[PDB]
Amino acid sequence: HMNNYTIKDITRASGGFAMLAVDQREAMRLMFAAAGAKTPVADSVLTDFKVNAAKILSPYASAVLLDQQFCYRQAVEQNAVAKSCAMIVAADDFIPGNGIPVDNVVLDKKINAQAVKRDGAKALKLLVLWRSDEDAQQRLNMVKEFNELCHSNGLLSIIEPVVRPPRCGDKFDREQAIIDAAKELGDSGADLYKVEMPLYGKGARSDLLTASQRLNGHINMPWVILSSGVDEKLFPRAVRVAMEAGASGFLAGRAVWSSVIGLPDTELMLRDVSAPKLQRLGEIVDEMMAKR
């Protein structure tokens, strides 16, 4: 008999999600180059930063998201993940194209779900790129195969729809695309929906709330906000507003650790600069869960 993990296994005791992403791959290599690291940036620079981020920040997170390419095995072998923090393993295969590192994404066929479970993983995660002029059924079929990979192995399924401009045309409304992706994928049988924040978290709180309530109405599973595209200083308000609209927390990377890339004394910087940001987000999640 299979004892599946449950969403409670990746939440704070409150039931809110306060989750850390360090699974960025070639996108993280480009961030090191942009911050002034010697090029070419060696794989070990990414591995060392990811494992240090997990070691120093995972005590503040209900779950951490790791990639097999650069850090899952290293984090497990080095006991970097706090025992209070669940492990999520990326199961997406990023395909570069058109001058960006993630132009297409397919399910990573190399992942051994039983083996990552034996190492302590509770969940897998799949980025789904959404475009108005690409076939919805191909996206749904990938999410169905992913759900089956997770559920047949007693793991949770986390999907992350991310909107992109159409392959052809200049008819792109990012705010409508986020809604349309949720109309398509918001009831797709995953355990958790990781979504972009409306309006990049910018502008009047009341307008962010209206936009977040509109999104909530199309998601029939628990949902959390991601930080890509949101200034680190606006992300705490984004979490408060999204949770007022019905979200259950956050799964964030850049808004926690991007600002320390290129500084001296990386471990001190992760403790003094990144950790207080992640701690505050956790406190906001508990405050919002207490109001239900």
Place this chain on the structure above:
Amino acid sequence: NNYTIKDITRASGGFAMLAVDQREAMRLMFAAAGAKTPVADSVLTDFKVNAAKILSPYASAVLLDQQFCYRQAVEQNAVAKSCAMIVAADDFIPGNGIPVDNVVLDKKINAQAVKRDGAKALKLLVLWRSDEDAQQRLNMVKEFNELCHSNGLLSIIEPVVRPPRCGDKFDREQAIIDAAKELGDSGADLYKVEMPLYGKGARSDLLTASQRLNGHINMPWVILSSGVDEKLFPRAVRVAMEAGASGFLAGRAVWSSVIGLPDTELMLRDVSAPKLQRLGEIVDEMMAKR
């Protein structure tokens, strides 16, 4: 009919579970603490629902009985969203001057209905006696496991040792072992067991007794608090878990001391809750060593 043990655990995988399903035994506790007799049913219901309301935020699951508090706790939204519900499925039969002389499966429990309303598990007390037929106990546990699993519920069994119907050859410590030899591989999802030696004495003796017990239980196991001083129960959880236990399913060591005090809800928050919180912390600390 899918079910998972993870529906009643902390995120650590440890069990930090609260029992408030005590029936006539709880009425006798109120009388002993000086309550006006006869103690009305509403006094037990109000205490049970207050205990669930104030303490369930600190518990991975709470155990409720239909006689006095399941329906009331559900209807009054007393159970924290973070805490799973376990419903008792035991029918306590009094005899020989005690409230629980025999136990059968409670035919009044509607497993489909408690599943519909959000329950994750049922619980069955099994009285163990050396001179009563083992196969009758096993047949009751088999029927119970099927009632649970066919309805998508977990099965929690609670073997409790009693002296033989005839004879005076009664070693409580050997009986706990003998009950686990009999029932420890019975197909239930969780074994709720009495703590060896009432949690008293040297840690070395408690660890040896807990390791011995571990060897006979082929499912996750948790300790109950009956007979353990509330001040010794945290050490009992530490020792039992060092031996292989996965936590506790406890009532008395959490809330017995506030029966009879003024301001019951303040007392549950200030006296009982810190005890339950510490046990939860111990469970996570011990799970972190695996």
Place this chain on the structure above:
Amino acid sequence: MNNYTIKDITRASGGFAMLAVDQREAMRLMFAAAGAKTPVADSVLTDFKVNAAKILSPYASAVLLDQQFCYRQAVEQNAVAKSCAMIVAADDFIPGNGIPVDNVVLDKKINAQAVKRDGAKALKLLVLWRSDEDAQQRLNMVKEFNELCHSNGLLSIIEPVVRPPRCGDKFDREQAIIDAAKELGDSGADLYKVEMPLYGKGARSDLLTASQRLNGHINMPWVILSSGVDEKLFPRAVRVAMEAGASGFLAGRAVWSSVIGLPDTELMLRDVSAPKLQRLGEIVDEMMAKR
């Protein structure tokens, strides 16, 4: 002279969440009563006090230590968490009439400069109060104590404790607590450590009325002590006292009395006593936030 201030012995909130382990022959009697081997050796008291300081001081804004059994040991062994201020007892307990503390004088063995050099921020003095003993003798002792503290840049904590009269059987404990506060509640000390009205028993409304009555007679910050209050009633006593104007607690028995005589002292202080002290600290912050 840069004197300490009451904020130096409070939580960041300004509430007092302070631990007393300075009990002397009274603690030896507790060990005997709990079934320890008699006669109880001094090392049993020293070891328990240092273990209590080591395990519980992380949860306290200040800890109160006596030189007789544990101050030097706690300092030498770095038992006091860096987050927890040290208070040194400056009372000399005189036994009599079959009890360990029948009279109290200022302890002339205390070297205030030496305990300050060790990091002490405050001294503490028990004052026994009896209706048929001279008020001026008590006030003169409190004045000498305030001068010992303040001339050395230390805080002064006074602890009036009511006793039945030397002669007679007219003893109203609740009126005595009020009368002691009328006498000593404006005596120039920095903090008043007082017994809880009504032993913290009975209806909340009556406890609050009694605590408000007491508050009106104390013209310095005040905290409640736990002697006489059941450990299970002490959290409510702190809440009600603070609602009446108290600023917290300086408590021993309601934190650690229950573990005396148990096996595994260090585990019991961590698992039984620490959660009680943690909860009291949480209640102090909750009540300070309502100001």
Place this chain on the structure above:
Amino acid sequence: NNYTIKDITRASGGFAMLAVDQREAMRLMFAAAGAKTPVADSVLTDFKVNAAKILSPYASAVLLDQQFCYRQAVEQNAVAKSCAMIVAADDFIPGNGIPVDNVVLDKKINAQAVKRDGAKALKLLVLWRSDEDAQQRLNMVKEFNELCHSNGLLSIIEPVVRPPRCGDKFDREQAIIDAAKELGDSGADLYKVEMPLYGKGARSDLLTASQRLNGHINMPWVILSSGVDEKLFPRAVRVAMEAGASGFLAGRAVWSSVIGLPDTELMLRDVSAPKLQRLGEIVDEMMAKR
């Protein structure tokens, strides 16, 4: 008219103090962040009072100016009861196209009146230049010390180095040392100093520079944040305190990043407060090593 340094410290003995007394320098920061010019006085007052209200619970003391916020903060009870008040006593004189070209004692300060409101300290910026008279700076500091001490207030001095009036021989690092040689034993209670090397570069070189500075200050000393990236200020506090500093009296590294954002109060709580909280934690961690 007693005073004690312990009126402005954490219980650890460290200083975790918030500056919101910036005057025309703050107006220039609002313009730089995209506010239309001229920026109204009310923009500065509202930001300062909000900063005191939301951040003073995390500070041992808060520094306020009479120009824009002292009276408003007092009238509105913006300063947490746990946070001491410091009042600026500097009169900034513009010149040469900058807001602070010269500084004299602010003759408008009524030391007894601000003490009656609860103030524990005054603060004076002293501009230091190698080719201006040292005795005039010492005389101003002595008059200030007497204003403070005679009225039961602490004296905080803030020497800030500037290039000489005439010449181009300016070594900022040597000037910081020379200012401390001049003023580091001037009878003030607290020295507020610029961080060597802007807090940049290798930790070992920052420590050596901070130790050199420490040797010339014969009173407790704290670092200010002007010139230090907000992300490097926590390391600067750690290194300065390793060298002998006792904490910080900082503004920009706490609240500069929220200037121009929507929802100022939420931003001060969610962005600025965690930075000030972390600095306070570092102060207690470094004091614990003494």
